[PDB]
Amino acid sequence: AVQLSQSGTVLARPGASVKMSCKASGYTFTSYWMHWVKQRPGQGLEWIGAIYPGNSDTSYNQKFKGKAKLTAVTSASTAYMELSSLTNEDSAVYYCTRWPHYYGGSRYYFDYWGQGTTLTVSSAKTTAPSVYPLAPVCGDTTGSSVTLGCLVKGYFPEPVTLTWNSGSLSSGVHTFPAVLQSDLYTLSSSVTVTSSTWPSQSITCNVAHPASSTKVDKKIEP
Amino acid sequence: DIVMTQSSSSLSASLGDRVTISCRASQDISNYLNWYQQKPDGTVELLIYYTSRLQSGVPSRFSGSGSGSDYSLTISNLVPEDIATYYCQQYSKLFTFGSGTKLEIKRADAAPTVSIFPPSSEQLTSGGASVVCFLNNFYPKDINVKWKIDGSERQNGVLNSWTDQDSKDSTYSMSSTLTLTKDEYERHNSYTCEATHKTSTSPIVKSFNR
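YS: structure for the whole thing
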């Protein structure tokens, strides 16, 4: 029914500028207001502003005037937002949602939202990750199980697909969120199996970084 | 501009519980306040509108109330899918979203299972030395990790990452990495990561020597 499809992940260097879209369908594009909301990693929702495709009226959250510019194309039923003078504080997820035009009643809200367009502001260039096996040492055993690990370091941009033994070993796995380390992402993952299964039965780490078409397999050795 | 504030930063409850989330405006917003739900996947959903009106298709488990500057969201009985982050929104004067409040399920207390890992030979040849320490499956979420090299605490060069509550066992897990230069790592013998958690007064110690 009512559908709001947004552009894909965008990568930009500081100072630069970008323009993302939101394609609406299933309703009269010119009967609603198109709003834009921002959300940084682990942060809350912050209203940016809105525009009325019908006549082109726009309302902005003072904070964003000079950073965000809203636009629309009735002929294509698509909303556009342009962010300028990009900085690190601009890296976040941006959602588009709709709000009804006044016509009496109380049904005014953000009933439909877009899936969100991720924007990452960085100067780093495409970088394939280094994969390091984490073999256990005395003390890395608990109960009748042992813990193994894999370290993915220095890659850009996100994401990376990490599996164990081609995907067959999925339980007892802990893949942690990537974090920054010199403008490059670093990620970790642990796997816990029955102490008897290792190392009689090999355990391998599988890393894939689409951006660089890289594929690395690291077998954990004692 | 009107500021919204949800004192409730993180809420812990049990399945079947009756949970209530607060929201406060800087001024009377005349009941112009909506409630939204954001699932861990990032999906956002409209729950209640105009303070107390339940949106179509939303489980009757949800309801809103309040007036003036104080408003709140209540869930009759909590179910697995309700575990998410909730935001309130005022629309009396432009638009403003609350700070947000996340829900988490209660479970039995669990001490972290700690394991430490020395730098791989591959990374060492690259001139780098990373020491990793896993603190898996613990509860509550509050946990403190400390690194020591040859018995001396070290803060610099430590990066941490936290997973969200597990959807199966409701536990939490942490990963701490101590990155040093190959030379530094080769100057010292013992590396230790200690975990401090509600489940005990004495820290969980994991260490190794070269």
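YS: worth flagging: Chain B touches chain A through 52 residues (CB under 8 Å).
IM: good catch. Also The two ends of chain B are 59 Å apart (CA to CA).
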